[PDB]
């Protein structure tokens, strides 16, 4: 007898780690769990085709930002029962509980699986040399800039490469998401969409949203991000950091894990970067301190022929023991608030910085149309990055691009 589960690649050998995780459940319930791994790049299409066709697995992983769109299709089984058995609303951060439903829905359609948020990895060796105090560089936008300026000047060189380091690496290729940009929007007092006057509307062209975007994009334009980083995507920037080309880059907690895995195992423990690794939160902007808070949930399709067994599996995967074990293999944080006290999270000084940074975690609203909003936003942001590649991103050029993005988002939202 067989349960089918789709996941994304959350760990170096993602199917083996998932199968190890569920072996106790399989033994206790007389069932086999067959897992399929979908790359993040294609998972949306396969999940959407499963949703409209009625041909799919019992359970799928969903990125928290996808729950609303899949739930609005009317294909997910209610899971209020599972969430109650896990301890209900009080067992989760509000930012995690919001991702359990479509915004405004009265019924839960996803079970929190793991959480992740974004912070700055830095080279302790590169900053020590450049004379940069990390507590100062990551406190404020002002500090951040002054720190990249000291890093750009530095004669420091990677021992493996023998070359200087880029102060900051961030991808300039049209992004899949706003996860890199949203902290700058939010720190300025901006937002992507805002609910006001009975309706959701774009806020990407607000003065605050434009101030934060322009701060971020202009770092690349003032030589803090080398030309070659503007031509790279998130994956090619991670590789660059691992290989000693970057002093500072923003990512999720999984880099700590990858950094303890040898290069032969899909990791980078033997590189200088892994041996000189610091983590610092996003700096405070003029209007506050925010980072992207994300993660993945698990949903049950309402056409599953195995709903009872699937719900025992969601309860298993959602519960404390499996929450710690899966976080240990993935480098993510558990979804369940209580599981953060595990010594495996509290005795890792880099992970404790992510834990502290979650106070400033901010999530997107769980809207049916969220994918189309982010898609329109990233297409226009990619045009702004192409102006950066020319030295021609002006406050007026950014505003005209974000005015076109707002008109097309406002259009999509009605």
Ligand X SMILES: OC[C@H]1O[C@@H](O[C@H]2[C@H](O)[C@@H](O)[C@H](O[C@@H]3[C@@H](O)[C@H](O[C@H]4[C@H](O)[C@@H](O)[C@H](O)O[C@@H]4CO)O[C@H](CO)[C@H]3O)O[C@@H]2CO)[C@H](O)[C@@H](O)[C@@H]1O
Positions in 98-137 near ligand X (CB under 6 A): 116
Contact predicate 38/8, CB 8 Å: yes
Q: Which tokens sit at 154?
A: 């530095």
Phi, psi of 47 (to 5 degrees): -65, -45
Q: How far apart are CA 257 and CA 350, in angstroms?
A: 10
For tokens 């299709």, what's the residue?
A: 73
Q: How far apart are CA 200 and CA 161, in angstroms?
A: 49
Is residue 244 within the footprint of ligand X (CB under 6 A)? no
Q: How far apart are CA 323 and CA 334, in angstroms?
A: 5
Q: Using CB atoms, what's the residue nearest to ligand X?
A: 63
Contact window for ligand X (CB under 6 A) among 186-194, 219-227, 289-297, 315-323: 289-297
Contact window for ligand X (CB under 6 A) among 26-34, 82-90, 180-188, 251-259: 251-259
Is residue 63 within the footprint of ligand X (CB under 6 A)? yes
CB of 257 to ligand X, least distance (A): 6
Alpha helices (H) along 302-363: 307-318, 320-330, 343-346, 349-357
Contact window for ligand X (CB under 6 A) among 137-145, 152-160, 248-256, 382-390: 248-256
Partner whose footprint covers residue 252, from Cl ion, ligand X, none (CB < 5 to 8 Å by kind): ligand X
Q: Which of 31, 139, 230, 239 binds ligand X (CB under 6 A)?
A: 239
Partner whose footprint covers residue 192, from ligand X, Cl ion, none (CB < 5 to 8 Å by kind): Cl ion
Contact predicate 147/351, CB 8 Å: no
Give residues with Cβ within 8 angstroms of 27, minimum separation 6.
none
Q: Which tokens sit at 106?
A: 């009265």
Q: Closest Cα to residue 116, out of 137, 93, 134?
A: 93
Partner whose footprint covers residue 294, from ligand X, Cl ion, none (CB < 5 to 8 Å by kind): ligand X
> How far is the CA of 173 from the CAs of 82, 177, 408, in angstroms?
40, 11, 21
Q: In the complex with Cl ion, which residue's Cβ is closer, 192 or 219?
A: 192
Partner whose footprint covers residue 351, from Cl ion, ligand X, none (CB < 5 to 8 Å by kind): none
Q: Which of 66, 92, 121, 385 binds ligand X (CB under 6 A)?
A: 66
Q: Which of 56, 252, 278, 281 binds ligand X (CB under 6 A)?
A: 252
Give residues with Cβ within 8 angstroms of 96, minimum separation 6.
112, 115, 295, 335, 337
Q: How far apart are CA 74 and CA 132, in angstroms?
A: 53
CB of 310 to Cl ion, least distance (A): 32
Q: How far apart are CA 88 and CA 333, in angstroms?
A: 19
Contact window for ligand X (CB under 6 A) among 189-197, 247-255, 272-280, 405-413: 247-255
Cα radius of gyration rounded to whole Å, the chain? 21
Partner whose footprint covers residue 191, from Cl ion, ligand X, none (CB < 5 to 8 Å by kind): Cl ion
CB of 199 to ligand X, least distance (A): 24
Q: Which of 71, 109, 170, 177 binds ligand X (CB under 6 A)?
A: 177
Q: Which of 254, 368, 383, 397 binds ligand X (CB under 6 A)?
A: 254
Alpha helices (H) along 123-271: 124-130, 134-137, 141-153, 182-187, 207-221, 227-230, 234-242, 254-258
Q: Which of 295, 318, 334, 361 binds ligand X (CB under 6 A)?
A: 295
CB of 116 to ligand X, least distance (A): 5
Q: Compose the 21-50 pattern: x for residues touching ligand X by CB under 6 A, - for all others.
A: -------------------x----------
User: Site size for ligand X, by CB under 6 A?
Assistant: 19
> How far is the CA of 98 from the CAs of 61, 219, 228, 364, in angstroms?
16, 33, 38, 9
CB of 117 to ligand X, least distance (A): 9
Name the residues that contact Cl ion, by CB under 5 A. 191-192
Is residue 266 within the footprint of ligand X (CB under 6 A)? yes
Is residue 238 within the footprint of ligand X (CB under 6 A)? yes
Q: Closest Cα to residue 280, out of 181, 146, 143?
A: 143
Q: Which of 60, 64, 71, 291 binds ligand X (CB under 6 A)?
A: 64
- Positions in the binding site for ligand X (CB under 6 A): 10-11, 40, 63-66, 116, 177, 238-239, 252, 254-255, 258, 266, 294-296
């Amino acid at each position: 007898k067989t349960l089918e589960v789709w996941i994304m690649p959350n760990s170096p050998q993602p199917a083996e780690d998932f199968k190890a995780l569920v072996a106790p459940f399989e033994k206790a319930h007389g069932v086999e769990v067959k897992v399929t791994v979908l790359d993040w790049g294609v998972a949306w299409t396969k999940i959407t085709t499963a949703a409209t066709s009625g041909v799919g697995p019992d359970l799928t992983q969903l990125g928290t930002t996808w729950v609303g769109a899949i739930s609005a299709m009317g294909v997910l089984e209610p899971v209020d029962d599972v969430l109650e058995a896990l301890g209900g609303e009080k067992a989760y951060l509000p930012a995690v509980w919001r991702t359990t439903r479509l915004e405004g829905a009265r019924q839960a359609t996803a079970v929190p699986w793991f959480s992740e948020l974004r912070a700055f990895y830095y080279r302790t060796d590169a900053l020590k040399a450049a004379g940069v105090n990390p507590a100062e560089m990551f406190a404020s936008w002002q500090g951040f800039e002054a720190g990249l300026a000291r890093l750009k000047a530095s004669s420091f060189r990677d021992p493996e490469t023998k070359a200087p380091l880029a102060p900051l690496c961030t991808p300039g290729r049209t992004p899949r998401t706003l996860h890199n940009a949203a902290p700058w929007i939010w720190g300025a007092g901006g937002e992507i969409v805002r609910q006001a006057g009975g309706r959701w509307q774009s806020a990407l062209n607000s003065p605050e949203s434009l101030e934060g975007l322009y701060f971020f994009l202009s770092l690349a334009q003032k030589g803090y991000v080398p030309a070659e980083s503007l031509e790279k995507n998130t994956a090619q920037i991670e590789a660059d950091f691992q290989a000693g080309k970057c002093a500072v880059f923003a990512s999720g907690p999984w880099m700590i894990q990858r950094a303890q895995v040898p290069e032969a195992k899909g990791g980078f423990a033997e590189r200088t970067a892994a041996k000189n690794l610091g983590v610092a939160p996003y700096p405070a902007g003029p209007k506050g301190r925010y980072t992207f808070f994300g993660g993945s949930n698990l949903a049950l399709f309402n056409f599953s022929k195995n709903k009872p067994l699937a719900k025992e599996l969601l309860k298993y995967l959602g519960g404390p023991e499996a929450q710690v074990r899966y976080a240990q293999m993935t480098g993510m944080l558990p979804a369940l608030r209580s599981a953060w006290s595990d010594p495996s999270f509290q005795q890792n000084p880099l992970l404790r910085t992510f834990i502290q940074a979650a106070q400033f975690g901010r999530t997107y609203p769980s809207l049916a149309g969220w994918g189309g909003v982010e898609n329109l936003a990233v297409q226009h942001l990619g045009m702004a990055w192409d102006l950066v590649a020319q030295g021609r991103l002006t406050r007026e050029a950014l505003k005209d691009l974000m005015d076109k993005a707002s008109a097309a988002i406002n259009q999509a939202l009605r």
